[PDB]
């Protein structure tokens, strides 16, 4: 309930004074009871020991700069960052769901006196949250950004007998309160130097603890764990910045295959995900050495766009949220243009377009109760992509050809959305799952012909993604929308709320408190209570 400290004291003391009894507990008896949910309280043993990692088990908050020498003689740094160690945070994530994993193995008809080598499957995400300042006193504010690195326990399993049996899955994967924060900093997502400085220790630990066994007593017997990390919450901009690729508006578009933007337009859907991470490392090495002595052009053509040392590891996937939003904006543009009726007469001035936009806005508002926006909301997208909107727009297009065109377009888009939309299309919507190939293919066919006036050259990349990489990702990784960033993006409001109402205003502790509160919020043994009214 985002209460402060003094407020809680007021409520407690007055309840006690009135009703005689003592329902709520005092403060010190609350600190001494939260010290059991932050990291670095439990005992744990790595084996074999972790290279380059300390062995102590008393590591709570630690400084994000990781001991970066900051004097007037070196590269100036002026950021703030706080973080948990990876291993301690991970063991706390485990000891905050001991009860759930026990209930799981019980329901699955197993023995609780079992300490088989469970395998965890984690999801990692990192999205900037710029413009989180506010005016202090009475005046303006300064545009300072921020970045938060966080993960999510997603699927715990165990190989009993001969096959693996699933013991725990997340109910709502990309929810607002099951992405647990791990590090946060007041930096920018493009200040590559500072970003790498802060995220180098975390990636070092994440690589180190990938060939070991963690041991800790899990309610009685001691139990062992392996790990499998799958970084997916990265949006297109990040995944295109860190992993090594060039900027966003390149000629090489898809971060999974390697085809020129033009070449995507000729052949739409027959490609194959062909971009690992070690491949990016060796390609950057080729770019650096240049063993064949080619000019910059032929070189960049050979290495397929990569021109920087891949700094992090990231699996190739589709950020469902931004993908849907981009498709929606794409359809908005095609509606504007179709009001333009430019397929007959092209290349108008940059006033007819403004007129088309304004009349489209007024019309759709007065017919569907939709106020005009530019920064498109996901809600705005869901409200726009409705067959009713197509029917309301079709009056402003003269001919039946455009009628049937827009009709078929929206119909196929809504027959393809559920596949990459649901959280497990393997069972929840298998019909579109088995139709998706033919569906997307005919969609592409009528997109090339009926609209060649627009998609004859440049085709925006998200279309290529939605068209030629969704079936393979499905077959590879089960769900799609499960591994999305929306599980994190919603945390921005929590960040701002905490920073406003729970902090100490020192720019140094001022992140310890925010991170601690976020961790506490996102626990599970602490929500099993707030969900009590479900008897």
Partner DNA sequence: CGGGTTTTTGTTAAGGGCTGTATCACTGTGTAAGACAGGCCAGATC
Partner DNA sequence: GATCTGGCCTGTCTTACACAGTGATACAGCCCTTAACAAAAACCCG
Partner DNA sequence: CGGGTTTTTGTCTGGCTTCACACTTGATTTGCATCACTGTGTAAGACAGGCCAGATC
Partner DNA sequence: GATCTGGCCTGTCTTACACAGTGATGCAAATCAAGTGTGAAGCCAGACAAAAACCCG
Q: Which residues bind Zn ion (CB under 5 A)?
A: 254, 257, 271, 464, 468
Residue 190 interaction partner, one of Zn ion, a copy of itself, DNA, none, beta carbon < 5-8 Å per kind: DNA
Of these, 160, 226, 237, 415, which contacts DNA (CB under 7 A)? 237
Residue 257 interaction partner, one of DNA, Zn ion, Ca ion, none, beta carbon < 5-8 Å per kind: Zn ion
131 is a site residue for a copy of itself (CB under 8 A): yes
What contacts 24+ positions apart, CB below 8 Å, involve 480-483? 480/317, 480/318, 480/320, 480/419, 480/420, 480/425, 481/174, 481/320, 481/420, 481/421, 481/422, 481/423, 482/154, 482/173, 482/174, 482/423, 482/424, 483/123, 483/173, 483/230, 483/232, 483/233, 483/317
Residues within window 409-438 making contact with a copy of itself, judged by CB under 8 A? none
**CA 126/CA 419 separation, integer angstroms:** 25
CB distance 255 to 238 below 8 Å: no
Q: Which is nearer to DNA, 163 or 379 (CB)?
A: 379
247 is a site residue for DNA (CB under 7 A): yes
Q: Which is nearer to Ca ion, 212 or 489 (CB)?
A: 489
- Return the half-sphere exposure (C-beta side, CA atoms, 13 A cut-off) of residue 113: 0
Measured in whole angstroms, the distance separating CA 381 from the mean position of its chain's CA atoms is 19
Pick from 515, 418, 404, 505: which is nearest to 82 by CA?
A: 515
CB of 530 to a copy of itself, least distance (A): 6
Q: Which residues 6+ apart lie within 8 Å of 201 measured at CB?
A: 66, 83
Q: Please give, one letter per residue, the 3-state secondary structure of 86-113.
A: HHHHHHHHHHCCHHHHHHHHHHCCCCCC
131 three-state secondary structure: coil
CB distance 119 to 158 below 8 Å: yes
Residue 502 interaction partner, one of Zn ion, DNA, a copy of itself, none, beta carbon < 5-8 Å per kind: DNA
Q: Which is nearer to Zn ion, 86 or 455 (CB)?
A: 455
99 is a site residue for a copy of itself (CB under 8 A): no
Of these, 489, 499, 513, 518, which contacts Ca ion (CB under 5 A)? 489
14 is a site residue for a copy of itself (CB under 8 A): yes
**What are the Cα distances from residue 189, in Å, to 65, 186, 240, 265, 311?**
16, 10, 12, 31, 14
Pick from 265, 398, 410: which is nearest to 338 by CA?
A: 398
CB of 287 to DNA, least distance (A): 15
23 is a site residue for a copy of itself (CB under 8 A): yes
Q: Which is nearer to Ca ion, 188 or 477 (CB)?
A: 188
CB of 320 to Ca ion, least distance (A): 13
Residue 55 interaction partner, one of a copy of itself, Zn ion, DNA, none, beta carbon < 5-8 Å per kind: none
CB of 127 to Ca ion, least distance (A): 4
Pairing of strands 81-83, 147-160: unpaired
Q: Which is nearer to Zn ion, 216 or 257 (CB)?
A: 257
Q: Which is nearer to DNA, 28 or 293 (CB)?
A: 28
Q: Please give, one letter per residue, the 3-state secondary structure of 449-513.
A: HCCCCCCCCCCCHHHHHHHHCHHHHHHHHCCCHHHCCHHHHCHHHHHHHHHHHCCCCCCCCCCHH
Stretch that binds Ca ion, among 300-308, 381-389, 483-491, 524-532 (CB under 5 A): 483-491
Pick from 386, 237, 351, 241: which is nearest to 306 by CA?
A: 241
CB distance 504 to 510 below 8 Å: yes
CB of 349 to Zn ion, least distance (A): 35
**CA 489/CA 147 separation, integer angstroms:** 11
The tokens for 204 are 């070092």
Of these, 16, 383, 450, 458, which contacts a copy of itself (CB under 8 A)? 16
Residues within window 122-161 making contact with DNA, judged by CB under 7 A? 127-131, 136-139
Pick from 86, 189, 182, 174: which is nearest to 488 by CA?
A: 174
141 is a site residue for a copy of itself (CB under 8 A): yes
CB of 464 to Zn ion, least distance (A): 5
Phi, psi dihedrals of residue 181, rounded to the nearest 5°: -70, 150
Pick from 388, 390, 354: which is nearest to 372 by CA?
A: 354
Residue 254 interaction partner, one of a copy of itself, DNA, Zn ion, none, beta carbon < 5-8 Å per kind: Zn ion
426 three-state secondary structure: coil
Question: How many residues at the interface with Ca ion, by CB under 5 A?
Answer: 3
Residues within window 349-408 making contact with DNA, judged by CB under 7 A? 350, 371, 373-375, 377-379
Stretch that binds Ca ion, among 80-88, 230-238, 249-257, 310-318 (CB under 5 A): 230-238
236 is a site residue for Ca ion (CB under 5 A): no
List of residues contacting DNA (CB under 7 A):
4-7, 9, 13, 16, 25-29, 31, 127-131, 136-139, 190, 235-237, 246-251, 319, 322, 325-326, 329, 350, 371, 373-375, 377-379, 458-462, 489-490, 492-493, 501-507, 513, 516, 533
Residues making contact with a copy of itself (CB under 8 A): 1-3, 7, 10-11, 13-19, 23, 131, 134-135, 138, 140-141, 529-530, 532-533, 535
Residues in contact with Ca ion by CB under 5 A are 127, 235, 489
């Amino acid at each position: 309930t985002f209460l402060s400290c003094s407020q809680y004291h007021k409520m407690y003391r007055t309840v006690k004074a009135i009703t005689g009894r003592q329902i709520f507990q005092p403060l010190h008896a609350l600190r001494n009871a939260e010290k059991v949910l932050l990291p670095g309280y439990h005992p744990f043993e790595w084996q074999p020991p972790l290279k380059n990692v300390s062995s102590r088990t008393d590591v709570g908050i630690i400084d994000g700069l990781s001991g970066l020498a900051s004097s007037v003689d070196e590269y100036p740094v002026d950021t703030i960052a706080k973080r948990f160690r990876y291993d301690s945070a991970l063991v706390s994530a485990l000891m905050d769901m001991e009860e759930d994993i026990l209930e799981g193995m019980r329901s699955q008809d197993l023995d609780d006196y079992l300490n088989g080598p469970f395998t965890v499957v984690v999801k990692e995400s990192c999205d900037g949250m710029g413009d989180v300042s506010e005016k202090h006193g009475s005046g303006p504010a300064v545009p300072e950004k921020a970045v938060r690195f966080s993960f999510t326990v997603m699927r715990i399993t165990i190989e009993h007998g001969s096959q693996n049996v699933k013991v725990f899955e997340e109910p709502k994967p990309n929810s607002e309160l099951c992405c647990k924060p791990l590090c946060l900093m007041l930096a920018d997502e493009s200040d590559h130097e500072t970003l790498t400085a802060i995220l180098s220790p975390l990636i070092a630990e994440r690589e180190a603890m990938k060939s070991s066994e963690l041991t800790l007593e899990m309610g009685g017997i001691p139990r062992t764990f392996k790990f499998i990390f799958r970084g997916t919450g990265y949006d297109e901009k990040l995944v295109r910045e860190v992993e090594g690729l060039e900027a966003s508006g390149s000629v090489y578009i898809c971060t999974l295959c390697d085809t020129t933007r033009l070449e995507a337009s000729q052949n739409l859907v027959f490609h194959s995900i062909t971009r690992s991470h070690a491949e990016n490392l060796q390609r950057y090495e080729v770019w650096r050495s240049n063993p064949y002595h080619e000019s910059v052009e032929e070189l960049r053509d050979r290495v397929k766009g990569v021109s920087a040392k891949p700094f992090i590891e990231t699996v190739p996937s589709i950020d469902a949220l931004h993908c849907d939003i981009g498709n929606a904006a794409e359809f908005y543009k095609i509606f504007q243009l179709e009001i333009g009726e430019v397929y007959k007469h092209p290349n108008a001035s940059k006033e007819e377009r403004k007129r088309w936009q304004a009349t489209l806005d007024k019309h759709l508002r007065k017919r569907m109760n939709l106020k005009p926006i530019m920064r498109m909301n996901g809600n705005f997208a869901r409200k726009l992509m409705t067959q009713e909107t197509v029917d309301a727009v079709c009056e402003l297009i003269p001919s039946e050809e455009r009628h049937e065109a827009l009709r078929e377009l929206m119909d196929l888009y809504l027959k393809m959305k559920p596949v990459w939309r649901s959280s497990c299309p393997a069972k929840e919507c298998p019909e579109s799952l088995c139709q998706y190939s033919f569906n997307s293919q005919r969609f592409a066919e009528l997109l090339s012909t009926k609209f060649k006036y627009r998609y004859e050259g440049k085709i925006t990349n998200y279309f290529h993604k939605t068209l030629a990489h969704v079936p393979e990702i499905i077959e590879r990784d089960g769900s799609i929308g499960a591994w999305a960033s929306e599980g994190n993006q919603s945390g921005n409001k929590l960040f701002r709320r905490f920073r406003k109402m729970n902090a100490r205003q020192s720019k140094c502790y001022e992140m310890e408190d925010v991170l601690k509160h976020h961790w506490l919020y996102t626990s599970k043994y602490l929500q099993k209570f707030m969900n009590a009214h479900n008897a």
